């Protein structure tokens, strides 16, 4: 039993709900919050950005000196830092940035990620911003993940959507 409140249960471990995945944290507190990460940490916009914001940008500044030490993650890849005020650990995956040209395949690599932790409140990679069918985003989690998935999808026309063409 946890804390997560008012999903909709897709599979044996994959939950969908519509929420802001920042306001999602802060009550929950999770385990694992995971961000809508690029390989250089830059948390502009999208997820990134409003989680980084809800921070007050440290972050930011934790991902800076990230990057410094051990240079920029690769496209599928992750890293584990500080959840800070929303969760106890925030795992940094990047999802394929379609916007840029990058291969869709590697969406399911990024899910992986996933897999080395026993609970995750996250959002649906390479979806939004990233520019990815969020529909696909979903079949890549729930063919991916076998650890326990709380998915946070912020628009509503997506959610409703989501849910109705869920197979
Ligand atoms: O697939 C990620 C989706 C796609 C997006 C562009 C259209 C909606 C942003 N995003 C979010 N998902 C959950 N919580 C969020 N909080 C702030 C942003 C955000």
């Given at each position: 039993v946890n804390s997560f409140s008012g999903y909709l249960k897709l599979t044996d471990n994959v939950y969908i709900k519509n929420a802001d995945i920042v306001e999602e944290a802060k009550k929950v507190k999770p385990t694992v919050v995971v961000n809508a990460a690029n390989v250089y940490l830059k948390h502009g916009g999208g997820v990134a950005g409003a989680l980084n914001k809800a921070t007050n940008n440290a972050m930011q500044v934790e991902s800076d000196d990230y990057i410094a030490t051990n240079g920029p993650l690769k496209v599928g890849g992750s890293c584990v830092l500080?959840?800070?005020?929303?969760?106890?650990?925030?795992?940094?995956?990047?999802?394929?940035?379609?916007?840029?040209?990058?291969?869709?395949?590697?969406?399911?690599?990024?899910?992986?990620?996933?897999?080395?932790?026993?609970?995750?409140?996250?959002?649906?990679?390479?979806?939004?911003?990233?520019?990815?069918?969020?529909?696909?985003?979903?079949?890549?989690?729930?063919?991916?993940?076998?650890?326990?998935?709380?998915?946070?999808?912020?628009?509503?026309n997506l959610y409703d959507k989501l849910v109705s063409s869920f197979l």
């Open positions: 500080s959840g800070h005020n929303l969760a106890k650990h925030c795992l940094h995956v990047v999802g394929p940035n379609v916007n840029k040209g990058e291969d869709i395949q590697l969406l399911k690599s990024a899910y992986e990620n996933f897999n080395q932790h026993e609970v995750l409140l996250a959002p649906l990679l390479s979806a939004g911003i990233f520019g990815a069918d969020p529909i696909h985003s979903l079949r890549v989690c729930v063919d991916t993940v076998r650890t326990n998935v709380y998915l946070a999808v912020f628009d509503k």
